[PDB]
Amino acid sequence: VLTAGLNSQQANTLHAFLDESRSAALSTYYIRQVAKAAAAIKSRDDLY
Amino acid sequence: IYATPADPKALLSAAVATSQGGGKLPESFMSLWRFPHMLENARGMVSQL
Amino acid sequence: RDKRALEVERTVSLAEVYAGLPKDNGPFSLAQEIDKLVSQGSGSAGSG
């Protein structure tokens, strides 16, 4: 309900924020829990 | 509607230039450069030749 | 190939561009958005 009340400028700002925050979280999770050992991913850069 | 007659003195010198030979005496470009400039360029060009 | 080109000039107001954007591009008054952006630590105006 809250994001629905945003000015479209605010809405775009919100998304920019959430997207940057989410990749940090998902990138971290993926490396620690999902990534295969064969892909020697140690950091977010190796994931790229 | 009716074109101004070509000046016959020029028609002659053109006719002569053609009959004199060479043949490849092409239309010059409608040049932006004045004579003194073009003269210097042509001169440098010939001295290279 | 060298030809004299037509030498022309045009005066452009950016205020006219910004105030002239299609509604979906967020038209705005340039002087006013500047004051807001300067008073605020950040922000944006218009799009594309």
The residue assigned the tokens 């959430």 is A18
For residue B9, the distance in angstroms to the closest alpha carbon of chain C comes to: 30
Interchain contact C5–B (C-beta under 8 A): no
CA–CA min distance C6, chain B (Å): 14
Measured at the CA of C15, the angle between CA A8 and CA C20, to 5 degrees, comes to: 60
Token pair listed for B40: 């210097």
Question: What residues of C are in contact with residue B38 (Cβ under 8 Å)?
Answer: none
- How many angstroms separate the CA atoms of B31 and B34, rounded? 8
Whether the CB of B34 is below 8 Å from some CB of chain C: the reply is no
Q: Phi, psi at residue A5, to the nearest 5°?
A: -90, 5
- Main-chain dihedrals φ then ψ at residue C19, nearest 5 degrees: -75, -15
Using an 8 Å Cβ cutoff, are A31 and A44 in contact? yes
Method underlying the structure: cryo-EM
Which two tokens mark A15?
Answer: 């998304």
**Any chain C CB within 8 A of the CB of B32?**
yes
At C22, which amino acid appears? P
Are B38 and B31 spatial neighbours (Cβ–Cβ below 8 Å)? yes
Would you tell me how many other CB atoms lie within 10 Å of the CB of residue A13?
15
Nearest CA in chain C to B30: C3
**Distance set, CA B47 to CA B34, B35, B39, C42 (Å):** 20, 18, 12, 67
Quote the CA–CA distance of C35 and C17 in Å, as a whole number.
Answer: 18
Say whether residue C4 is in contact with chain B using an 8 A CB cutoff: yes
Nominal resolution in Å?
A: 3.4
Q: How many residues does chain A have?
A: 48
The span from the CA of A47 to the CA of A29, in Å, is: 11
